[PDB]
Scaffold this motif. Structure first.
Motif, mmCIF file in Angstrom:
data_model
loop_
_atom_site.group_PDB
_atom_site.id
_atom_site.type_symbol
_atom_site.label_atom_id
_atom_site.label_comp_id
_atom_site.label_asym_id
_atom_site.label_seq_id
_atom_site.Cartn_x
_atom_site.Cartn_y
_atom_site.Cartn_z
ATOM 1 N N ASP D 189 -72.264 -56.045 -27.258
ATOM 2 C CA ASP D 189 -72.934 -56.374 -26.066
ATOM 3 C C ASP D 189 -73.207 -57.677 -25.588
ATOM 4 N N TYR D 192 -78.171 -59.970 -30.908
ATOM 5 C CA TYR D 192 -79.329 -58.930 -31.388
ATOM 6 C C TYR D 192 -80.057 -59.882 -32.466
ATOM 7 N N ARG D 205 -82.265 -55.282 -32.510
ATOM 8 C CA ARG D 205 -82.623 -55.227 -30.922
ATOM 9 C C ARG D 205 -82.006 -56.237 -30.125
ATOM 10 N N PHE D 206 -81.331 -55.625 -29.003
ATOM 11 C CA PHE D 206 -80.615 -56.449 -27.978
ATOM 12 C C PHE D 206 -81.590 -57.587 -27.532
ATOM 13 N N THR D 263 -75.937 -61.576 -22.824
ATOM 14 C CA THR D 263 -76.862 -62.086 -23.534
ATOM 15 C C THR D 263 -76.740 -63.677 -22.890
#
Ligand SMILES: Nc1ncnc2c1ncn2[C@@H]1O[C@H](COP(=O)(O)OP(=O)(O)OP(=O)(O)O)[C@@H](O)[C@H]1O
Ligand SMILES: Nc1ncnc2c1ncn2[C@@H]1O[C@H](COP(=O)(O)OP(=O)(O)OP(=O)(O)O)[C@@H](O)[C@H]1O
Ligand SMILES: Nc1ncnc2c1ncn2[C@@H]1O[C@H](COP(=O)(O)OP(=O)(O)OP(=O)(O)O)[C@@H](O)[C@H]1O
Ligand SMILES: Nc1ncnc2c1ncn2[C@@H]1O[C@H](COP(=O)(O)OP(=O)(O)OP(=O)(O)O)[C@@H](O)[C@H]1O
Ligand SMILES: Nc1ncnc2c1ncn2[C@@H]1O[C@H](COP(=O)(O)OP(=O)(O)OP(=O)(O)O)[C@@H](O)[C@H]1O
Ligand code: MOO
Ligand code: MOO
Ligand SMILES: [Mg+2]
Ligand SMILES: [Mg+2]
Ligand SMILES: [Mg+2]
Ligand SMILES: [Mg+2]
Lengths: 267, 272, 267, 272, 55
Positions: D189, D192, D205-206, D263
């Motif tokens: 995604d 992290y 944790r993102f 991100t």
């Protein structure tokens, strides 16, 4: 007197004669002064096949032990076919040049396949192929003959036939690299008064200059005439020799400076 | 200790020779990359005739560009025969003659492209065909190329004559790209039972249609390579190939539209 | 302990420190350990012309008999002209690099034309030109110093001037091929405290490290500063020597290991 | 006597090391050559999954072409890891490994371009990209390329692993061309605090947004190179870079439209 | 205000496929003032403003 040269170069145009005269007064540097350039005709030699090529291969592997050799190839009759086609189509000299370059490269490839077992390569970068020439076990290269003017060729006054073909390529490569000797291997003992294959009354010519060669008003010659204007304008190589490669030994004798065929002198 | 460092994959630890292990991965039919492409192989015997045959052909092509996206591959012709004669006098092997003929093909292509440049056509060399073909065709409509495949020193042995010539390379390209059609242009109406320019000219019967097998099993000359008939059997996309005379106007234009104006050769492909 | 390395390589990202540490623990292979790299300045040497180039050609033709030489060329002032032009337009560092590469290639061509009669070629392929570097008849090659980062050049913190030029190209070629020593031939006896051409109080420096070199807060250096950060981070070559090529013999003595000019050490 | 022959210029008689002398000439901010360009770096870990991840991606791109002018750069993936494994067993230096990985990148690119050829897409080598990308993009809409920069035998030392990899090269290009945006496509995604595919994935944790400094001053792995951060610090045009998962449809499209789907990494650039 | 905008758009074309829709502005306010003095209904004013947009 180089400061004047420099300030002129930076200020004037290269058409400025004061500048050209300053430049002519500059030094001269021969890059391969110990090297000898020869041109293997395509239509006169290679297009004959085995009988004319194997002996020359022998002569070459023999001579490379005493001379440096830059062997340029000619195009031949495939090029004449191409020129016929392209002229029928009305395409310009540049295209025809692009086409003949290739025939010369094919012939070079063939010759190199013949000579590879002897350590003689085919090189695009002929002049600065320094290594093979620095060695005594190679001491030779094959550089296809047609020049790089591919689409920028200077057209002739009349026609689309490229005037600066293989002969000119080899000769200019010699003049540039300051070579000591320039030889044209062909199917005749030398230059005559006329094409002997068509006129059996033609008379041999052992030696002549460019001016005399023009005065004779030759309809056909064994060399491209522009090569003459180039030779009259050269600085390093001032004469060339034409010989018959079908006669055994002639090439070896010529490399030794001997006069066996025809000699053409700028002056 | 000296064990092999493998990259995890379905084909890992395989030789790619056992078909029972590759079929689960590579046994499926491929796709078409340029299904919208039309391939035209001009023979060298055509271009060798010069203007008389090229100018009409050039006008036809000029009229075809807005209709199709064209890859025009040329053949060698007679100069290749000359270079063969020489290389054989010298005893050179087939792998040494192949490139020497590919070159004559390329020169014919350069000629044609020069004649067509006014229309946005140009010659590509073959790296560009393999990789950058789609873009060179998004720019313009047609491109010219050489038909001889690059098997130059890797040519198959058995014969002193390079079996993989123009026809073969054109077909291999087209079947790889999954092209829409391949069309061959010769100096004759099509395929016969015998050379209609030879001594058996009288017994020559035109073949309007046939299969690659009927020919490959046969013996005798052809206007097309036999390696072509061999690769046809292993084809994936191309179902038929039309041989047409380019000296006759309008036949090429029609063939590109699927008309039966010459000889039709069915491949081993099975339609849907 | 290669299994851990392999499983990490296949699983982790190359930013994984465990992986970097495993890799650092790997072997070290030197490709041309017997070879010496030298960089001929363009603005400092070649742009001077005959007086500075012919002697060096002699020195080189002499040294290749006992040493193995990779001669990288610099660009010179033509490159500075180009950089000024392109910066006046606001074009980025990558373009300027594309441009200077060419100037470095021209100077190499000239030098190679000078050296061809001695069997020393110009090579795009300096690292894997195995033949010339093997033959005592040659034992040398001329390459061109500007690196291949053409448009991907890392820009400097401030400006468009490419920080990694000829100096860096030559040094990195040395560090990669594990060469034994790296030399910079220029127009000064070595590194001073300041540009002696401008300041006359500039003090010589025979030897120094990179850390001390930075602490001195030099406004101008005889080398590109990034080369220092590279040298501090290298594995094979941990020092370089700068010498004056206008002084005869300095290069030959340096190749022998002498301390002729300035020596810069990573540590 | 042996004085230097200078070409008159502002930078004449300079070493280009004294910044006080170059700043008056080269101390200003450059321009954008292709400000209308969008750059997309596909990771090799994506392409290594094959059709399952490529076909959807291919359809997305197919739908993006008419919307943007795209330079699609590819990464290497696992084959590069294998070649590193080998070269390190052999003790080769980083400069020897760099090209060996650039090649795997190029092959992934050739694959993708083959899948997209039907749409006018092709693969362009590093010199074409550098010297002539504008024309190749005036012809068609997207072109594919390799992301690894050509630092091949001249890579920076310090590590046995080439630090300048795909991400870095993509960014350097984009910032040179002054492109509109750079977008990175990974198999996760985004970024992290730790490798979510690793041992400490539970604590990962993102990070929806961050700066290059915060990362570069940290320690630990990343889906992107650290040299990327080092060059970001010296960027000129690009202000932000978005990392997105390409396994999830629609995120790449959105990112190209400026959406915040993964991100965001802010560079050192200060906008107006 | 238009010339800078025009240059910006000139620089956007190669980047996007654009549909640029204009609005009316003040002339529409004038035609509204008039039509309202005359008591015209909103459906009579709408096209009158659409036209200023088109211009
Ligand atoms: N005045 C002349 N003297 C001698 N030979 C001549 C003369 N005029 C024409 N020739 C003929 O020209 C021929 C050589 O020219 P040609 O260009 O055909 O061969 P080539 O130059 O060796 O081959 P290529 O042109 O392919 O390099 C010879 O066969 C020779 O018979
Ligand atoms: N069975 C046949 N049917 C028709 N033509 C034949 C047959 N056998 C031989 N030919 C002859 O073969 C010639 C073509 O030979 P070839 O295919 O080598 O030339 P091309 O294909 O035009 O040139 P290239 O091979 O360079 O493409 C034709 O002119 C034709 O007369
Ligand atoms: N601290 C210093 N010590 C010694 N020389 C210096 C110093 N600072 C500047 N210089 C100058 O730097 C010059 C060398 O740098 P320059 O880049 O101009 O030449 P080069 O690097 O040999 O050529 P090129 O950059 O084309 O390779 C020398 O002429 C010298 O005068
Ligand atoms: N901090 C992190 N946040 C997110 N992912 C991480 C982090 N650290 C490591 N990773 C992992 O790194 C992997 C990507 O590695 P890498 O970046 O080398 O591959 P890639 O970039 O897709 O391929 P290439 O390097 O050829 O472009 C991801 O699959 C992810 O699991
Ligand atoms: N809440 C608000 N916030 C910002 N501006 C406002 C607000 N309320 C009113 N305005 C004003 O409204 C004006 C715009 O009015 P309007 O939207 O009718 O013009 P326009 O949209 O530019 O033209 P058109 O309606 O023909 O497109 C602005 O100049 C602004 O000053
Ligand atoms: O046959 Mo030539 O060498 O083109 O004149
Ligand atoms: O003159 Mo350079 O570009 O510093 O080598
Ligand atoms: Mg095997
Ligand atoms: Mg045929
Ligand atoms: Mg310098
Ligand atoms: Mg990544």
């Amino acid at each position: 007197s180089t400061a004047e040269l420099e300030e002129l170069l930076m200020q004037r145009s290269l058409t400025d004669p004061q500048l050209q005269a300053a430049a002519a007064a500059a030094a001269d540097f021969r890059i391969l002064p110990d090297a000898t350039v020869i041109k293997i005709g395509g239509q006169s030699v290679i297009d004959r096949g085995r009988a004319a090529v194997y002996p020359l291969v022998d002569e070459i592997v023999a001579a490379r032990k005493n001379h440096k050799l830059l062997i340029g190839t000619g195009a031949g009759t495939r090029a004449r076919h191409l020129y016929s086609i392209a002229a029928g189509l009305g395409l310009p000299a540049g295209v025809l040049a692009q086409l003949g370059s290739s025939v010369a490269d094919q012939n070079a490839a063939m010759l190199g396949q013949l000579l590879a077992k002897h350590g003689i390569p085919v090189v695009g970068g002929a002049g600065l192929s320094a290594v093979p020439l620095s060695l005594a076990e190679v001491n030779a290269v094959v550089f296809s003959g047609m020049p790089p003017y591919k689409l920028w060729m200077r057209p002739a006054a009349e026609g689309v036939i490229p005037p600066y073909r293989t002969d000119a390529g080899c000769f200019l490569l010699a003049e540039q690299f300051g070579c000591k000797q320039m030889i044209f291997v062909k199917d005749e003992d030398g230059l005559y008064t006329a094409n002997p294959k068509t006129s059996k009354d033609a008379t041999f010519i052992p030696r002549i200059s460019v001016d005399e060669m023009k005065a004779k008003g030759l309809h056909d010659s064994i060399l491209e005439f522009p090569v003459l204007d180039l030779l009259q304008s050269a600085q390093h190589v001032r004469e060339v020799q034409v010989v018959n490669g079908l006669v055994p030994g002639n090439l070896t004798r010529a490399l030794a400076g001997e006069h066996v065929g025809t000699i053409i002198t700028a002056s | 200790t000296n064990s092999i460092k493998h990259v995890i994959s379905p084909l890992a630890r395989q030789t790619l020779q056992d078909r029972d292990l590759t079929r689960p991965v590579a046994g499926k039919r491929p796709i078409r990359l340029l299904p919208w492409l039309q391939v035209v192989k001009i023979g060298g015997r055509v271009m060798d005739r010069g203007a008389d045959a090229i100018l009409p052909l050039v006008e036809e092509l000029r009229k075809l560009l807005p209709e199709h996206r064209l890859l025009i591959l040329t053949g060698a012709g007679v100069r290749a025969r000359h270079v063969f004669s020489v290389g054989l006098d010298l005893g050179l092997p087939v792998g040494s003659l192949a490139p020497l003929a590919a070159s004559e093909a390329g020169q014919n292509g350069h000629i044609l492209a020069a004649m067509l440049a006014s229309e946005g056509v140009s010659y590509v060399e073959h790296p560009t065909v393999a990789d950058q073909l789609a873009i060179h065709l998004s720019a313009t409509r047609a491109v010219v190329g050489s038909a001889f495949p690059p098997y130059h020193h890797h040519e198959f042995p058995g014969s002193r004559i390079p079996p993989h010539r123009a026809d073969t390379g054109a077909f291999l390209l087209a079947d790889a790209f999954g092209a829409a059609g391949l069309t061959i242009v010769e100096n004759v109406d099509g395929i016969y039972t015998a050379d209609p320019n030879g001594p058996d000219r009288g017994q020559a019967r035109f073949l309007p249609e046939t299969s690659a097998t009927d020919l490959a099993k046969s013996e005798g000359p052809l206007p097309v390579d036999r390696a072509l008939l061999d690769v046809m059997a292993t084809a994936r996309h191309i179902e038929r190939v039309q041989v047409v005379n380019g000296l006759v106007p309008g036949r090429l234009t029609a063939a590109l539209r699927g008309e039966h104006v010459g000889t039709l050769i069915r491949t081993g492909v099975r339609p849907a």
